[PDB]
Subunit: 440 residues, 3 copies
């Protein structure tokens, strides 16, 4: 029989598991723990103390080491014998030469994981990804594999790492593994559809977890234990929306406090727009922009009243229109606070009127909120900025108070501020006024 | 009447968005035309105080904004919401992409409002590049934002790509896709979809419908969307295009581009920085003098054919004469601009090749290469025979090529006496002055 | 009319006419004509330009057509559908015609580089024109692979014959990948090369290299190979020793190009961008890089001597694989210890020596002193040269430490290796290697 000793967490093992299926070679799987859980008896079988190892023959049992030599043994043992290593001496040489480069790519990716907010380690990953894309382009005509439509050993050697790095590098370093390597992305995309790859691949959450051991303990997302991570600030009204959504939909997230002006030199790797909020998912995806984060939170959250009224197109319109108009209110309010323009005040008034008039139709029934008795995405969109308006006016506008001219919007503001969700999110009005005084 | 009434202009990419979604989702509506700008009626301004189209009317109540209207239609036709994505993750990607389309549109209209601005051009390069990176970050195979799946992300943008491809070329000499190959593939695929094909304006309407943005002084504005020839009254290469135009009654708006130096803006219209250049009503560029002659001869409907189509051997004949004309031109201009026996011998050889072919009379009787009238060969050479007549013998230290090549002299003479020649060429003395100015400029240091 | 084409099978310009002929399904009588010093006077009579091709049309009224592109268009114009290879519209045709007008520049850059293959400046000029041709394709394409996407047209025909020959020839003569700056041109070639019209008229890779030899300078370093295998080499390099052992053992002929080192010539980076010897170039114009991968290539294509890799036996291929990997670690330790000292490197060397020794003691290839038993295999070849270096280095430069006193089977392998005729024809004397180590330490300071 063939006995393969592996961890389901190990990309080197995955190489061998892919080849086995590609070649229709059967084997008995033996689970073997890694690092502290690696047993002594296994170290006696393989003194290099790594997985995989292959054991051949029942009676006179011998061992084979190293994933690429084992992969090659399996390829040489199923028909056509050796096909995965190429069909000509020229093609085989190009597969061999490629294989002799994959280790630098791996080393660069693991190096980034070990220091994920290093600029210098980020540039090394860029350069190595680009380098590999150049090797693909030099060998390819059409793609998607290294030898075009033929899946070979070149692809097997690399794919297990592409699978795990895509979510892992986004989650731990805000890095897109493919940003400098479009050809490598098309190679990964086609490889991931092959039964041999998809039936042996771990989940995105598993790829993040299985790489946790490389990442430094002080990296900002580590306290999340693989959960949703919200990059945040206690004073930012845009973040407030996300945290309101989260409180309203009982949506657990790990809060990372990012200071602002100055923000840390690394935050630009998490969001290239250098703004909070930013949400990262347990699948290693980035969800950017406060109201987009709110809408995301509302799609996947299980507990609560819906913030977006799915199933009703007209009601979805109302919420969409209020949120758009809330955007125009925000732009007007924030400009007017910071630079004090007259064009700014007029745009604030216009947008308030758009909000107020739709509030006056009560499309979500009676009650003080745009959502009626309860807050919807509309309410979440506007409330933090009404709170900012309450702090700014009339102290810092020589007497002008927007809320004297817009009673329904003042109702929504007072009723929002008085909810439990609001009081677990917002600073005190004085803290907001003080922030304005520091700013000017 | 129907449940849905849509207020639109056929000139409007924002309406095109909603019209695409209607057909994708197979949702029917009554169309109501609304005039734009000065023509917008008050009854419509009362319906939508933002004073833009589209607006949707349901039942009654109104719904504003193309992206909100598009989403209503997506949320009203099975399968409900499908254009906005099949998962939270995919829907987020679409929504983030939709939040960036505004800036692309703004960079595009920025360029149309100031089409020869380097600064607005750089900004369009950067926003196109940026859109392509967004596409690269979400795509694997393409062609759409979500690969094989057409979604709202494509719908938002497609109407602008359709109109900007011909508009940015015509008004700016700018290729909308030069920094955005993925965006090109997305456009190309979308254009073949039923929903987009059947609701698209023609290339000429695209150009017309953006004219209102373009400065009045922009150099191509007097063409009123017709053919535009970037020209100069003294350039023999331009004379070919204009002779061809006269011979085929092909209407073109002439734009006089001064030379030595040419205006800085001209390199935007032809990156080779040369005249002539022809722009078409469909917003395409046609570069190089003899290529332009050829193009004019393909699309023109009046006059005798410059290229003898339907007869392979005679088409060879013209091609051969035109190639040889090319060597004559190289020789002559090189000898006029710099002297040199190398260039003089080139001229003589080329003249000889042309003379030997005229001697075979493949187009029958007459003084022209084309017999009784001028063909593409005659058009290619004549302006250069005219420059030779001005240059020789006064500035060639006595040498007169026409004394040694009589059929080519025949061609020049008969060419110069046609009405087309007399409507195109300057006087022989004007060409002599041109030559004298050039020579003095060359002695300036 | 009845057709006769004068061609050479070596000439890409004739190739163009031959491709169209097949695309259009036009028949012709082929007449071979010699080139250069072989061109006969009777053909020089027919075409005073003294170039191939020429087309003779008709048996009664013999007339001659010149120039591959004019001849190509003539065949396009007399086969149904008439003129389709020049495009289905005025617009597409214009794009085809403009592209045709740039091909000559690309040919010139490519021939200019063959004429001076190790020139940085000719190589840059080739990079830039290859990049320019790719931008033209980008500008006209939506999906590729041809200039007009799925339609094969005259733009492709004009360029394909050159790509076919230049791929092998530029690699063989210049170490240059014709497509490195032109990925779209590559897809265009790879698609055209599957068409019957192109596949059945293309010469072999070897013929492409021979047919271009006449352009390449006599002093270019691969010229003595007369198209054969070329090994860039150095008489003192143990990585090169691997390739030369494989060669000797498999009776594998190669033209040795001695490349000096420390400093290597400034052109060597063009042959191998890693700046290292050995590098192997094949008759088909492929580069084979890295010493042990060269040993493996050699062992695949050779037909004489015993196999170095035991193909057909998975388990035995594993043993050789594992030994070569472990030799890899030994080389790493040895070289690092010699060059820059250090106890880390000495421990690596020892460990690796033990991996090798333990595999030897199982004698997986049976009785005898070599890892391959009675004869050397890929394993012995990977390691012998570095055993020789080990013998030169120790104990003289290692303060008395002699690795071979601790690993007797490895010592046996070394001794028996060194006594082979193959090793005697490859290696320098031990004394020479000792000076080479001394020279390196003196060069260090
Ligand atoms: S995935 C966990 C590790 N695998 C390897 O490092 C295998 C690398 C070999 N070079 C190969 O076979 O190619 C591993 O087992 N590391 C040690 C541990 O204890 O986890
Ligand atoms: S409140 C702090 C700032 N946040 C934003 O501007 C978020 C705006 C986005 N449009 C959104 O998430 O909705 C901030 O992070 N400022 C940092 C800076 O340097 O600009
Ligand atoms: S006569 C003015 C010049 N025109 C051309 O040389 C056109 C040549 C093209 N190859 C063609 O249309 O055939 C000109 O534009 N000179 C400007 C300059 O900077 O060279
Ligand atoms: S491939 C051999 C040469 N052919 C050409 O250079 C043709 C050039 C024409 N302008 C064309 O048809 O495109 C050739 O005949 N060179 C001279 C020789 O004796 O080989
Ligand atoms: S012995 C001369 C050196 N050869 C190599 O380093 C080849 C090593 C490769 N891995 C191989 O071919 O096996 C050499 O050329 N050194 C020069 C340098 O730039 O490093
Ligand atoms: N944001 C609006 C924009 C609509 C718009 O700008 N429509 C234009 C037509 S191109 C318009 O009605 N312009 C005013 C006018 O034509 O007078 C939407 O997306 O629906």
């Amino acid at each position: 029989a063939l006995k393969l000793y592996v961890s389901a967490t190990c990309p080197f093992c995955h190489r061998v598991e892919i080849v086995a299926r590609e070649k229709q070679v059967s084997y008995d799987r033996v689970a073997v723990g890694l690092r502290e859980e690696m047993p002594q008896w296994y170290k006696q079988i393989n003194p290099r103390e790594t997985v995989p190892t292959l054991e051949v023959g029942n009676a006179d049992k011998r061992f084979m080491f190293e994933s690429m030599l084992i992969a090659q043994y399996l390829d040489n043992s199923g028909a056509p014998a050796g096909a995965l290593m190429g069909s000509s001496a020229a093609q085989r040489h190009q597969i061999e030469f490629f294989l002799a480069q994959v280790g630098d790519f791996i080393g660069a990716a693991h190096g980034l994981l070990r220091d994920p907010l290093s600029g210098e380690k980020r540039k090394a990953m860029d350069d190595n990804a680009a380098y590999v894309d150049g090797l693909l382009a030099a060998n390819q005509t059409t793609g998607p594999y290294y030898c075009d439509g033929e899946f070979t050993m070149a692809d097997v050697a690399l794919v297990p790492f592409l699978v795990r790095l895509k979510p892992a590098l986004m989650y731990y370093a805000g890095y897109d593994v493919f940003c400098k390597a479009p050809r490598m992305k098309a190679l990964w995309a086609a490889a991931a559809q092959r039964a041999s790859v998809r039936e042996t691949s771990p989940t995105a959450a598993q790829c993040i977890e299985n790489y946790r051991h490389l990442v430094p303990e002080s990296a900002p997302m580590m306290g999340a234990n693989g959960g949703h991570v919200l990059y945040s600030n206690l004073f930012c009204p845009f973040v407030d929306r996300a945290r309101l959504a989260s409180e309203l939909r009982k949506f657990q997230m790990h809060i990372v406090e990012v200071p602002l002006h100055p923000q840390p030199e690394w935050y630009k790797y998490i969001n290239p727009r250098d703004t909070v909020p930013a949400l990262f998912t347990p699948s290693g995806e980035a969800v950017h922009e406060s109201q987009l984060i709110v809408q995301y939170i509302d799609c996947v959250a299980t507990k609560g009243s819906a913030l977006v009224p799915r199933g009703d197109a007209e009601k979805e319109y109302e919420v969409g229109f209020f949120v758009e108009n809330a955007g125009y209110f925000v732009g007007g309010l924030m400009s007017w606070i910071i630079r004090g323009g007259e064009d700014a005040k007029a745009e604030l008034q216009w947008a308030a009127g758009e909000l107020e008039q739709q509030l006056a139709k009560h499309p979500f029934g009676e009650g003080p909120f745009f959502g009626g008795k309860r807050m919807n995405a509309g309410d979440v969109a506007i409330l933090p900025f009404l709170v900012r308006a309450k702090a700014f006016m009339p102290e810092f506008s020589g007497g002008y108070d927007l809320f004297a001219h817009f009673p329904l919007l003042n109702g929504l503001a007072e009723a929002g501020m008085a909810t439990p969700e609001a009081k677990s999110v917002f600073r005190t009005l004085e803290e907001y006024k003080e922030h304005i005084r520091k700013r000017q």
